[PDB]
Write a protein that binds this ligand. Structure first.
Ligand code: SF4
Ligand code: SF4
Ligand code: MN
Ligand code: MN
Ligand code: MN
Ligand code: MN
Ligand code: MN
Lengths: 202, 203, 203, 202, 202, 202, 203, 206, 202, 202
């Protein structure tokens, strides 16, 4: 192929996967709760532009790697991979659904979140920890492992404290009400919506 | 858990896999033909030091990506993966076995696929990776080859369809056996675990 | 307003003008002719990714300038703006159409006006801009063109009068068709949105 | 010699300068957020002030206002380049606070100011905000929009609170009374009067 | 407002600039050692050209000649500010090469040029020498004295060979046909026409 | 000889020396009490990786220096070299042996600890001092000497106060229960387990 | 012709002007209340060395520019130039005279003009300059003063209208006489010609 | 012990060793042949200053390493250590005794003598250094040995080189002539920087 | 001449003068009082290494200067040069004699200390000030002059307050008990015993 | 006020300098090795040249020849400050090449020249060497010693080849005609007459 046969295939499967998930009206993904609110909303308001995230090479790397590593978790830890669930909360009155997909779960029960930075500075990153903390709440699990596979180091962290629904709720209204953007100062640097976004840190 | 439940396991398996590859006396790996001769012989003389390679996180990351990208190939292109073959050559007046292991092979005619990962997409494709693949095309008598890099800055795929001819494999082999030009590439010494005892280290 | 009443509308109108470029087969636009062949092909093959060029602020800005300076050229030089034509050439065996849209043509005798913005006034006139206009001379059978730069550090105008010969246009069209000379200019890969998947990317 | 297109742009731009001739007691809204000494110098050294006509970023900004303004007319039902004025007492004397709004949309009303900047640092710039808050008073609008078209980014801000009449008076006091020059530390770097000005920041 | 002294110096400087009336067919000596495109801009965009009047290094230079010229008149018995023109033939058409010498001494005469620079680097600079050598042929003089007063050093050079009338032709030609612009590669950096000039070195 | 006749021998004797020291379950080395508790536990959980330490050239230099300076001591100060001893302590009500080996002991006894660094910066280093102070406790010796042989300086320090047994017990607790890792901020930088350790300083 | 016709003369006349003034006993000049006390004493003790100040091209440029600007001041403002005067002050129960020479004075009441020339327009107006003029306002009992700079980057005029109070002048005078706090300004030693023998040089 | 017990003893023993070796008017050490001639003569003419080189901590470090590594060599390889020997050379019809002391010798390893020279430095840059190899090659002539090993123990690297060609006698005579006639000083460019005689030497590179 | 006729003689002469300083028993020079006490002690325990100081070229230059300048002080100020004297003090129970040698003295009495340096920075240097304040006490002089001949500056300083015994005694204390080592933090950088000294500052 | 010793030294240097009147057809040897214009300037601008007297470099250099020269009279039985002249023939006229040797040793005769410098870089400097080569001719001596006393090193050089008469005359030729200024490119950087000289290098 002019792109290359393997390249063409991975890009084609990754686009179909990205197109796969239409988000319901009142559903908030776990991953959205720990990202910039404007970014989340842009993903919904500017889907055509949002599609370019499919062609991010570190994303493709990360997916192949979750696939690699998830195989071994199935076959030695008897784990469930890519496990979805919902759980409701009420926000300013309205009922919102919080939707998450865990990289792996083990059945007490263990949630496993796999990450791959290109750098091992500062591990574990607060936003990766929060995410996992929220999945603990989501799946009502007692134990969490956050495991980083980076070129400079492999490191694994036990995270066992779930986030309190009270803060989950307040992370939620911050997402719905676009209250504080960006969520972390580093987000704008890599954000594809910074070309049009008024809130962009400069 | 001291090291971690997950990483304890990956380390255990990777140590196991490393110890499982025993090399015969007159056998040269394809990967040996495109790297420093002294390094190849140190890996045979100082195996207890060579074990330290098992723990290089880039190798662990690299092994997990092969496992992922290999399962996608097996699933959607009807590829065999981790395929071994041997082939004999005469070097000097003596028979050696060249052994290789393809990351994946596809039966259309056959296509040898070599997966590569790195932190950098600089200089792609690297000459020593292309040689590796060109040698596998002779080893497997295969018609076509794909070298595909998965790196954080770029996914890049190259088509290598020309095999190295046997006389040049023989000459690569001669270097290997007789320690002729060490290192093979000037960048190697910097990452070599043997540089600390090696007189030919570039400085 | 989430994005903002005015910006919402500009991005909406620019998305639609983008999506309305139904590309007919055997048709090569002048602006494709002077860019990297693989990039043109990437644009036809990964349209979902290519749409992201819609949101380039330099393109929105450049368009607005074009509109700005275009209203003036209509009402004072009596020119036609956004003027589409096409012309057939014989490339190898096959017959291809070269299509173009001049920014402005004043008639008197014809003059083709190409307007450019840029962040920098360094190196004016740029050789790809020049080439593009020299191709528009041939395409509209004009004998005079003007390249005008509106930059923050300078306003500069250039009289470009020699059209490109058909043989050079043909030689360029080959490269587009058979993916040769990628990239055309070494600076291109730096700003190419396909650099993340292209194996020919300069590094 | 100079070039057909640009010889025209410069001619046409000189005439638009030479046409507006500021009466004795007129202050432009743009003068209230500039350096008072610079305002005064433009009045006192009009042969030198002419040199501003040929700033290439002014020509660019003017071409952009044109293109964009014609889009505001065509699709938003807006009036472009809307002149108005308002008189005020600054210590017994009557001053004309004159202003030209880039565009207005009357249905009950919205002032839009368009800006072109070489970069997107610091958006919205406070002098630009203030200028817009002056126009809301000037044109008695309840709403304004500040829109930036820069090579790095497009962004848009909703400014809804007009400046107090008193504050505008104080601004005019500082303007005629030459009180705090420059108004901002970046001004002198670009000012054509720095070669004769004693207040120049070094 | 500007201050009592500077007002006067500038009004007088301005008025001396608007006085210089350039006849159709006349090229200045100083124009022969400058960028052909630059002297043309000066007649085509006079309103912009007026900003040179406010170049502080020019004011300072003037003030210098003023101070120095009592010395020249009293003790050297020279005429200062000596205007003259001469006729050359270029392209069959015939031109007036006109010049103003800082100071002349008739005895066998010696023309003298005075320069200020912030810097004594490279003295004498080649376009100053070239200038003196055109005043030598203009005034048909046998001796020239170029003298620099810089803050780093005072320096004086004897230029006693004039340019050949033949040479002067190629340079008046350059100036009319706008051939080699800019004449010296350092000109564009300081040129007030660089903002609209397509030949600007960049 | 591929490696070299002399080097092959040194690396064979180092490796066999390193393989000879197997640790019993309730035994802590004196060197362990002044190092990172995690690193200590890595050296016993990842013995195959730990073996790479045998090939650190600075260790080989160090050992040969010890051997040389050990021989001088023996033949002119009637010292015993490489003296091992063992003393028992109570931790969490359990019995551990602290085991150590002094480079040399003289005659009233003096424990000598020899160090070689490639730099004389900051001597004596706190962790080297503690080691020695522990050997005083261990050998119930009354004097300690810490001598550094570096390429920039020879420096000798008299250290005669032992660490009390309670400090030793505290150090042993940290070691058993991985309390504070790394013990010293500079450790991670040179630790062969950094590549798999979650506590690595970054 | 060795040195040059013009410069030879300029140097000759500058030298004479230097030797033309000899300082009175119990007299302090204003120019000296604003300079380092040791330097002022050095100028009496080491007149042969002090004479090198004559050849300082900055001073030459400086004198010429005072001449030209003065010429304009006296034929258009009807200014008096180089106006000498004195006042008496008590210091140490002893009587001293402060003397000075205003560059120009102009009427309306009197305006003291001080002219300055500097290489750079940095930090205008420099505090010591301002100080000099304030002392002249007290000396001439003038109520209004103009400091005017002619630099290559900029022309800048300042109205200074407060005179220094008499106590302060006395203090400046005490320092001058008792050599108390030298240098007066930290930047002085860098240019002082006596830095080579001065114990107090800042270093 | 104000200086310290161990330090005091090493310094005392090293000054003794240095002072034990008085050099005769017609001998040339091997070590001299690969050094600056002016410096070698300075070591005879300014012996009081020369003595400061005793207190160079790299040299004390260096000698302890030789001691310790040498003791390995006497055990497992049956080497002699610090082996002194002498060989004569003609230079302008004057006869000269070239004298050297090899760090270790293996007299008979399968019908071969091996001279071993041990070296230490703080960096492994550029190994092996040409003046080290020359020194080993002169010993090879001195002992008439067939094999040479130059081994570097450095903090970055251990590295061993097999050097088997001895310098011709003519080359050694050329080295000797320069030593005697003070011909080309310094011998190597990096010398003066470390040379304790640079403070009085006119040939010092700047 | 291998070394050279003149330098040979100079070094010969310098070595002789260095060697001819027989150090009496309970004796501390003034020049030792102002330096690190360990350095003083090293100079007494390692005579052979201290001899290298004889070949410091700045000390040779130093001595040639003192000679030349001292010839002027006899000649035109009728002063005694290289004047020697001592004076007992009492240190905590014992009796030591402080001994000094002043560069020049003029008889009331003026002690002159002459100093060179390649740099005039920070003059006068406190340790030179201290040396001379001690001379005034040793010689019962009332006035002192410190004169620096340096390539950038000649500078002379009047020092008229001598140190009292209490402080001199306290300085001798340090010299005896090896306290306050080094006295000044720049000393180790130049000290030839830093190669063996444990208190070297690093 | 300036200091007792300092005053005397500067007072004496001044007198010394002021003594030396150069007669009409004379050229010092030290003038043959210098810029011709500087030698000329020292004649035509005497007042300025007196500033050379206050060079601290030179005062140090003087005090230094005094010390060393008193060793030279007293151990090598030499003549310090030996003055002589020799007539040469240039352009028909007869000139007196005077010179003063720092010292001479009379056995068969040796000229000694002492130099000071704050740097030992590049010894021996070519122009110090020429100076001694001309002195060998002047005194017709067979041997010469150039000796430097710098603070980094003492270094002695033996110079025996006396300079040619023909090229001595070619030097005087340029001294007279101002043929090549400066002689050496480093000269202008320390020249007191660079402030008024048109030859100065920049
Ligand atoms: S050097 Fe500094 S202190 Fe000494 S006189 Fe000149 S200015 Fe005053
Ligand atoms: S090193 Fe520092 S401390 Fe040790 S002696 Fe020399 S100076 Fe005193
Ligand atoms: Mn994950
Ligand atoms: Mn265009
Ligand atoms: Mn030890
Ligand atoms: Mn003035
Ligand atoms: Mn002294």
């Amino acid at each position: 192929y002019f792109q290359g046969m393997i390249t063409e295939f991975l890009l084609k499967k990754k686009l179909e996967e990205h197109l796969s998930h239409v988000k319901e009206e009142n559903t908030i993904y776990v991953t959205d709760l720990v990202r910039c609110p404007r970014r989340v909303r842009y993903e919904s308001e500017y889907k055509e532009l949002a599609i370019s995230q499919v062609y991010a090479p570190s994303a493709i790397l990360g997916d192949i790697l979750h696939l690699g590593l998830e195989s071994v978790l199935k076959g030695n830890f008897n784990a469930e991979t890519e496990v979805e669930t919902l759980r409701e909360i009420n926000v300013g009155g309205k009922v919102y659904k919080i939707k998450g997909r865990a990289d792996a779960i083990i059945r007490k029960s263990i949630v496993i979140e796999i990450k791959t930075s290109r750098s091992d500075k500062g591990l574990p990153l607060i936003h990766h920890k929060m995410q996992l903390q929220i999945y603990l709440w989501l799946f009502s699990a007692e134990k969490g492992i956050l495991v980083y596979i980076t070129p400079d180091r492999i490191a694994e962290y036990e995270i066992n404290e779930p986030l309190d629904e009270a803060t989950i709720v307040r992370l939620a209204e911050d997402t719905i009400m676009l209250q504080n953007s960006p969520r972390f100062n580093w987000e704008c640097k890599y954000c594809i919506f910074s070309v049009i976004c008024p809130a962009k840190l400069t």
